[PDB]
Amino acid sequence: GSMTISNMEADCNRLLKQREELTKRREKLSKRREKIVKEKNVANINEEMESLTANIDYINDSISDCQANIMQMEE
């Protein structure tokens, strides 16, 4: 349709917000863990930061896939 490509763009770009939110969340845990080891319970932070990283990497693959499909749609 007329807005099909525009909608694809908007939907693919929602992935950027996922990445941003997860990146900051991972950063919040980094500065938090840094203070604890400076002064334990970092194992829980390590487990979550590693989860966030795996999801950030997943999103990055999704961005490449999504943008590639747009390129094919536009060719």
Residue numbers in the entry: 2 to 40, 46 to 81
Question: Which statements did the authors publish about this structure?
Answer:
As a second case, we used the regulatory coiled-coil domain of the human kinesin-4 motor protein KIF21A. A recent study showed that the minimal KIF21A regulatory region folds into an intramolecular antiparallel coiled-coil monomer in solution, but crystallized into a dimeric domain-swapped antiparallel coiled-coil. Here, we aimed to stabilize and crystallize the native, monomeric coiled-coil form of the KIF21A regulatory region by rationally introducing cysteine residues (the construct is hereafter referred to as Kif21a_M947C). In the second case, Kif21a_M947C, we recombinantly introduced a cysteine residue to stabilize and crystallize the native, monomeric coiled-coil from the KIF21A regulatory region. A schematic representation of the KIF21A intramolecular antiparallel coiled-coil (amino acids 938–1017) is provided in Figure 2A, illustrating that a native cysteine, Cys1006, is present in a heptad repeat d core position. We therefore introduced the cysteine mutation in the juxtaposed heptad acore position of the coiled-coil to allow for disulfide bridge formation. The stability of Kif21a_M947C was assessed by thermal unfolding profiles monitored by CD at 222 nm, which yielded a Tm value of 37°C under reducing and 69°C under oxidizing conditions. As expected Kif21a_M947C was found to be monomeric under both reducing and oxidizing conditions (measured molecular mass: 11.3 kDa; calculated molecular mass: 9.5 kDa). The Kif21a_M947C coiled-coil fragment was crystallized under oxidizing buffer conditions. The final structure is composed of two intramolecular antiparallel coiled-coils per asymmetric unit with a disulfide bond between Cys947 and Cys1006. The results revealed the classical knobs into holes packing mode with the pairing of heptad a and d positions forming d/a mixed layers typical of antiparallel coiled-coils.
Coiled-coils are important protein–protein interaction motifs present in ∼3% of all eukaryotic proteins. They consist of two or more amphipathic α-helices that wrap around each other’s hydrophobic seams resulting in parallel or antiparallel filamentous supercoils. Here, we present a case study for the phase determination of coiled-coil structures using a combination of native or engineered cysteine crosslinking together with native SAD phasing. In conclusion, our case study shows that cysteine crosslinking and phasing via sulfur-SAD is a particular useful strategy to solve coiled-coil structures by X-ray crystallography.
